[PDB]
């Protein structure tokens, strides 16, 4: 059997297989009915189907055979400056347009232009986006650009004005869980109760991350070889998520407020290898959404967590930061 990531294995092939993006699919179908395809700005929460929808539109345009020749897929966060991405775009545009075959012409409405897709375009700097706008202006005759992003507001106005914008709604929990369940049933993945829900919660609704985590869990279960169902602890381990019992013990140690007990527990915890950033994130999730804490406590603890996260992002010692954060929370 061939090996392929399940993210690219289960991408929808045509626009009719997009589940929850009714508005974007309808607008894209209307645009496809028109003889001219403008520049496109696909924006929305991650794992909603932006890349899937643009790939489906590209296939319905060029045919399954000629799609690969007419498409340049790039990631906008590529390092070594904007120069590498812009030069690749220039080389793709200067390259001669492949002649469609008789079968492709008679079966699909092949347009003269080629499509360049940029992923995570919102991560580009302002100068990089201005250079991309210049390149799009120069080669507007033969190349149509599709910019995929999470935040449309991170794209400069001069670049955004040239693009017709498609907003993708966040996938409902039922739709994402049904997609994950269908993928698991197709691949004969055995899962316990609430395992897919735990995967969705860890991925924060991102279906790409959920599918990747499900594939990783299936691989781990195959490695184990006992034939038992995948459990929540396994997927927590694979995603680097601290178990809930340890977080509850941390919360209780904070509540007691003894400095020596907290220091001893943090010393014991740092030996287990759990990531401190995951601990800070889960403490934030627990405390902010908890109804047993008043407004002042949350006001203080949000700043405490923000300071701890900012210091952790600088590449510091996890033990000291975690102990300081826990002590400061316990003094609240």
């Amino acid at each position: 059997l061939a090996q392929q990531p399940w993210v690219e294995k289960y991408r929808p092939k045509n626009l009719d297989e997009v589940t929850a993006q009714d508005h974007a699919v309808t607008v894209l179908k209307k645009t496809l009915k028109s003889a001219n395809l403008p520049h496109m700005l696909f924006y929305g929460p991650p794992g909603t189907g932006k890349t899937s929808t643009i790939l489906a539109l590209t296939k319905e345009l060029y045919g399954p055979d000629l799609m690969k020749s007419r498409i340049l897929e790039l990631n906008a966060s590529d390092e070594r400056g904007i120069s590498i991405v812009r030069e690749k775009v220039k080389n793709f545009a200067r390259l001669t347009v492949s002649k469609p075959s008789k079968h492709d012409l008679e079966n699909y409405p092949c347009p003269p232009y080629k499509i360049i897709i940029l992923d995570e375009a919102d991560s580009m700097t302002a100068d990089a986006q201005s250079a991309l706008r210049r390149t799009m202006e120069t080669y507007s005759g033969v190349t149509r650009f599709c910019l995929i992003c999470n935040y449309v507001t991170r794209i400069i106005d001069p670049l955004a004005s040239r693009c017709s914008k498609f907003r993708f709604k966040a996938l409902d929990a039922s739709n994402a869980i049904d997609r994950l369940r269908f993928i698991s049933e197709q691949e004969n993945v055995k899962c316990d109760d609430g395992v897919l829900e735990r995967i969705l919660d860890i991925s924060a609704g991102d279906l790409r991350r959920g599918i990747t985590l499900l594939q990783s869990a299936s691989k781990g279960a195959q490695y184990l070889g006992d034939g038992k169902n995948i459990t929540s602890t396994q997927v927590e381990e694979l995603a680097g998520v601290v178990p809930h019992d340890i977080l509850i013990e941390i919360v209780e140690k904070v509540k007691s407020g003894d400095f020596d007990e907290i220091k001893k527990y943090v010393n014991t915890f740092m030996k287990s290898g759990w990531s401190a950033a995951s601990v800070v994130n889960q403490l934030h999730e627990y405390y902010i959404t908890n109804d047993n804490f008043d407004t002042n406590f949350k006001n203080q603890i949000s700043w405490l967590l923000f300071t701890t996260d900012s210091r952790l992002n600088n590449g510091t010692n996890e033990h000291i930061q975690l102990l300081n954060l826990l002590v400061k929370i316990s003094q609240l």
Binding site: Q3, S77, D78, E79, R209, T212, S216, K219, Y223, L224, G225, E237, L238, A239, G240, F259, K263, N267, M270, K271, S272, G273, W274, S275, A276, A277, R311, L312, N314, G315, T316, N317, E318, H319, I320, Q321, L323, N324, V327, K328, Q331
Partner: protein
């Protein structure tokens, strides 16, 4: 050789602690062709490198231990020459790109590429993956995407937080917790039975484990040092032997606690200079000083909270700074002020 190196497990069957991880590694090695990229994260001196070498031995045979060290020369675009120490075997390579600092990225983009041109696959071990720059990590992700056919990466780190998300998604996360005190005691008992060391009681070994704070390498070296000091006859009254820098740091902590003045700060400056001039890292000094100060029994809760807050602040400043003595002296001065 030293007991820490003579009795290092040379195979997956020779591992004695973290049984679940050993079984997982055996299952992983059972299918060499479908071996994923691995990222082993855990505390220092727990056996990550030993487990990586044992997995490589399970895959490619004992020949992975025929290690030869060479120096590879690279040219970066400003026409600058860099030298990287590469430990290679007929089956795998080991690199520590962080030794090149910000110049790690280009080095990787060379060396891995060269191996991909030379090549079923060759395993590349990357040490201190958490200290790689973000550009180097992006280049590593690119090489994972491109040369996955011939390159399988095994990264080792103490903290997975500095690792970027795209690297994490494409690699298998392996958590390596530090062994419990019972496992450390069992390992030390095996070592002393192999070396014919007299023990009044096994409790001494337990104490050594409690002194190592879960660091198996530290516990083994401490056991060897204690055996050497006591003429290969360990007694229940044999004191725990600590390294010189730890003793100096404890003396500095006692000095700081006892007296708080400008002259004491001046002498602490000389102590810190002595520590820094002999290859003791600033972060290590700060961590040891802070956790020695927090262990003083005469300090109240407020003093310890102030100490830990200043430790966090000056640890961030050390990570963002260039001159270590500046931040260390600032931290010590703040602690001295807070103790009064």
């Amino acid at each position: 050789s030293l007991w820490v190196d003579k009795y290092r497990p040379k195979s997956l069957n020779a591992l004695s602690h973290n049984e679940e991880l050993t079984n997982f590694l055996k299952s992983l090695s059972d299918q060499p062709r479908d071996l994923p990229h691995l990222l082993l994260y855990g505390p220092n001196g727990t056996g990550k490198k030993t487990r990586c070498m044992a997995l490589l031995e399970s895959i490619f045979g004992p020949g992975v231990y025929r290690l030869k060290i060479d120096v590879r020369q690279f040219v970066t675009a400003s026409n600058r020459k860099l030298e990287l120490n590469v430990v290679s075997s007929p089956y795998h390579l080991e690199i520590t790109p962080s030794d090149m600092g910000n110049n790690d990225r280009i080095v990787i983009q060379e060396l891995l590429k060269e191996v991909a041109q030379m090549e079923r696959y060759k395993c590349v071990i990357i040490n201190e993956a958490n200290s790689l720059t973000k550009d180097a990590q992006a280049a590593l992700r690119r090489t994972m995407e491109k040369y996955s056919k011939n390159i399988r990466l095994i990264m080792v780190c103490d903290s997975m937080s500095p690792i970027i998300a795209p690297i994490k998604s494409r690699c298998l996360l392996i958590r390596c917790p530090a062994p419990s005190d019972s496992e450390i005691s069992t390992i030390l008992s095996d070592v002393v039975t192999n070396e014919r060391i007299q023990l009044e009681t096994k409790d001494i070994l337990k104490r050594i484990a409690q002194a190592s704070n879960g660091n198996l390498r530290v516990s083994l070296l401490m056991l060897e040092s204690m055996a050497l000091n006591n003429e290969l006859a360990l007694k229940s009254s044999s004191p725990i032997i600590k390294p010189d820098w730890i003793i100096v740091i404890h003396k500095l902590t006692r000095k700081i606690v006892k007296e708080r003045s400008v002259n004491s700060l001046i002498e602490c400056r000389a102590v810190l200079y002595d520590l820094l001039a002999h290859c003791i890292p600033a972060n290590i000094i700060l961590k040891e000083l802070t956790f020695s100060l927090l262990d003083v029994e005469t300090l109240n809760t407020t003093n310890k909270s102030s100490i830990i807050e200043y430790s966090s602040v000056f640890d961030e400043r050390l990570s963002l700074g260039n001159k270590a003595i500046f931040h260390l002296e600032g931290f010590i001065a703040k602690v001295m002020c807070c103790l009064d």
